[PDB]
Design a protein around this ligand. Structure first.
Ligand code: HEM
Ligand code: HEM
Ligand SMILES: Cc1cc(N)nc(C[C@@H]2CNC[C@@H]2OCCCCCc2ccccn2)c1
Ligand SMILES: Cc1cc(N)nc(C[C@@H]2CNC[C@@H]2OCCCCCc2ccccn2)c1
Ligand SMILES: C[C@H](O)[C@H](O)[C@H]1CNc2nc(N)[nH]c(=O)c2N1
Ligand SMILES: C[C@H](O)[C@H](O)[C@H]1CNc2nc(N)[nH]c(=O)c2N1
Ligand SMILES: [Zn+2]
Lengths: 402, 404
């Protein structure tokens, strides 16, 4: 019934009992595991509402209380007549942190209780959304001393279109498709660059042009808003011993703010609820700069390092990746902007796994995402078995609005 | 789309559907409620149906599906099971099944080689002494003075009542792990138990970091007998670095031949409890897992010290830097010693080609992502960006309980 989970470095074993609380099926069946895949009415809403209000009052040790009975009654009353309900700010705050806590793909969950939540549910226009988005960025960046935050726009409603941020992150570099097939700037962002231009943006021609935000209020053409350059902290990349590295003119932004995921709490859905923490250095160093379908800088670096490129067995790739990760760590430290390396991050995650075992009887985790993109077995998470399942509140993927 | 798993490669942006998983007869450990893909560890009427299915696979592989030889062989199997409870495989059926078991193995990144496997039939073997001869012959052939050749030796299958053939050691070549008075381990901590069992059964132990263990071989219904490998048979590679001159002075070494001896090979219901197989190493197995795991040789700190790295802080990437050099040393030393080895880039590129072959041939390929992606430099290899469907096909290599 309950999965035995072993750590192979320390020989220790736990039993996950928290998965018994899952209500949403994943992609796997007894016939085939599909775990490495990146992508996937009153009575129903009511029971998700009840369950979540239970979660809430239990979390403040007021389970069973008067205030608890009277809240379940309100929600019942509101659904029974409107087909939906609304959350109190504190319940919202509880739900957002729990959605982060439950995120199986997140290695930063040790921080889950430290989350600044901006209630933006009194938002009626793209203009307003933009104002909130700027306050979020200002707060989250905090002159390099990054602080986690989420800003929660108005929930989905039966009648009308969603509030949406079209951009996948609040900060993204343009990718400019070229006549000769290739991309200039960030290949991940070709389509979103093209949508911006379509909706009227004057393009630049650099590899690090910060995109404008396309913000959408229900049932309206999305609107374009340029972030003021002052708001977007960037870090120029250099290397501590290699002088020529800085000459590559490479850089990256401080704030990782995801803005396309949907926040589900108690069956309510928040289609625009951007959140940010801080980067783990491998996201920038390994994936963003070294993925072949991204900035793909490995060879350029290896050639600068005068490495033997002609053969795989010289490990020129592994050697250059390390220097690029180190340049990221060094550059962020020198700019006094928050960053965590993959060894410190996974060590803190083990700690988190242990806390959640005592607290909840397990922890949902996606091994393929938790283990870093380089030096996997050098980190303690590699050696840790992990059980993956969906709890609610949750961050989910959603369709692109166009 | 089709209702078969859609599978995407995020580097190339290409889609396939896996239709081969339809063939799976054995449940793995996952359910809609929770994914368990990261766990290392997840007869009668039954026999006949497994047997029928293997025979059909066999006749299909030789394009004689529906033929008289096919239905007569089916009939031949049914009759044999009807009277004896069991049946026996024809020689070419065993060769086909051993290859197909390797081809079906979701945890093996080396499967582009699957069609090239030397199968030694040893189903005549009737003593622990004779197992030893077969194994020595295997090691001799597979090692081939360094020009390694994949091979499997197949010992008699399980029988009703009668006891199993078993090789007690988990690999044909293993270094001793000696438990110290201060709680530490000299040698390979992975091998503490088998070391203790060897001693119990009369082995005179050494005291090095790289003592080759003897074989504990078990014939039906007997206590296991102990056999020492002649050291000229066990090819080893001393380890050195191409530029760090001090690295040879560590006295690190590894053996050439990776030969797994504790897996059960299952074909058409029949269970071969002793069927050791060998290939050649991918360098990360040695340079990263065996030499650097905290619970194995654990040499990272030692190497980083010699390289003068700042080991007091994670953020110097000292671990990553030391691992790279240890991996480079493994590759360099094997190349120098003319012993076959494959780096993790070459290997995983080769596995992408194999995935594409099998898409055309069988409509998919069972694959365990967490095992296929190397333990260093993950996202630098193309398999990282490749979604994979994991499932159990038969023939198969399975794990089995330890014989003690
Ligand atoms: C405190 C700093 C944080 C760090 C260091 C961190 C670390 C990471 C990393 C390395 C990933 C994988 C990223 C990738 O490969 O693209 C990730 C994913 C994720 N994190 Fe965090 N995280 C942090 C804070 C947060 C916060 C504040 C939230 C939400 C409130 C969050 C929710 C998520 C979610 C939902 C994912 C999966 C994203 C997706 O599927 O696109 N994390 N985290
Ligand atoms: C030809 C060269 C070969 C290479 C480079 C290779 C590579 C590998 C690697 C790197 C692993 C992962 C092991 C670990 O993490 O410790 C593995 C596992 C495995 N390979 Fe191979 N392989 C080769 C040949 C073979 C052969 C000949 C067979 C059997 C006929 C085989 C069957 C297996 C099986 C069953 C596993 C799973 C082992 C387990 O779970 O303990 N491979 N292979
Ligand atoms: C449709 C879709 C939406 C989404 N949010 N995520 C995915 C998964 C892919 C895998 N690569 C790009 C995208 O995920 C990027 C998520 C980046 C998270 C950045 C972060 C967030 C918080 C803390 C530290 N770092 C797909
Ligand atoms: C009970 C059990 C049996 C088994 N064979 N394998 C495992 C998995 C664990 C994970 N680490 C050690 C052990 O697996 C060792 C597999 C050795 C593969 C060696 C190899 C074989 C062929 C080619 C290249 N490399 C468990
Ligand atoms: C196909 C595979 O699932 C995909 O490349 C995953 C693997 N693990 C990952 N892990 C993290 N943290 N981020 C990712 O984007 C991915 N990509
Ligand atoms: C917990 C996890 O399953 C375990 O550490 C796995 C991960 N991936 C692996 N991959 C390979 N090739 N070999 C292994 O032994 C492991 N170990
Ligand atoms: Zn699964």
């Amino acid at each position: 019934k309950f999965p035995r989970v072993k750590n192979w470095e320390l020989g220790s074993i736990t039993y996950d009992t928290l998965c018994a609380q899952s209500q949403q099926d994943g992609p796997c069946t007894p016939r085939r595991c599909l775990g490495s895949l990146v992508l996937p009415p009153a009575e129903q809403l009511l029971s998700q509402a009840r369950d979540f209000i239970n979660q809430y009052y239990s979390s403040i040790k007021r389970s069973g209380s008067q205030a608890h009975e009277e809240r379940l009654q309100e929600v019942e009353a509101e659904v029974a007549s409107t087909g939906t309900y609304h959350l109190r700010e504190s319940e919202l705050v509880f739900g957002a942190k729990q959605a982060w806590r439950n995120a199986p793909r997140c290695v930063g969950r040790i921080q889950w209780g430290k989350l600044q939540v901006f209630d933006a549910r009194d938002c009626s226009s793209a203009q307003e959304m933009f104002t909130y988005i700027c306050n979020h960025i200002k707060y989250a960046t905090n002159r390099g001393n990054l602080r986690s935050a989420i800003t929660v726009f108005p929930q989905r409603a039966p009648g009308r279109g969603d509030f949406r941020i079209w951009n996948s992150q609040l900060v993204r570099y343009a990718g400019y498709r070229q006549q000769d097939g290739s991309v200039r700037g960030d290949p991940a962002n070709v389509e979103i660059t093209e949508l911006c231009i379509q909706h009227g943006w004057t393009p630049g021609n650099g590899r690090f042009d910060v995109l404008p935000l396309l913000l959408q209020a229900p049932d309206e053409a999305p609107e374009l808003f340029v972030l003021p350059p002052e708001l977007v902290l960037e870090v120029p990349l250099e290397h501590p011993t290699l002088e020529w590295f800085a000459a590559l003119g490479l850089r990256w932004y401080a704030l990782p703010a995801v803005s396309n995921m949907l926040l589900e709490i108690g069956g309510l859905e928040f289609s625009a609820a951007p959140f940010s923490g801080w980067y783990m250095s491998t996201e920038i160093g390994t994936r963003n700069l070294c993925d072949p379908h991204r900035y793909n800088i490995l060879e350029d670096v290896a050639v600068c390092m005068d490495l033997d490129t002609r053969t795989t067995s010289s490990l020129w790739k592994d050697k250059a990746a390390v220097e690029i990760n180190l340049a990221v760590l060094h550059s962020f430290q020198l700019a006094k902007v928050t960053i965590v390396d993959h060894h410190a991050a996974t060590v803190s995650f083990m700690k988190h796994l242990d806390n959640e075992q005592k607290a909840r009887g397990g922890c949902p985790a996606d091994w393929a995402w938790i283990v870093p993109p380089i030096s996997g077995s050098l980190t303690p998470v590699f050696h840790q078995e992990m059980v993956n399942y969906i709890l609610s509140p949750a961050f989910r993927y959603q369709p692109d609005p166009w």
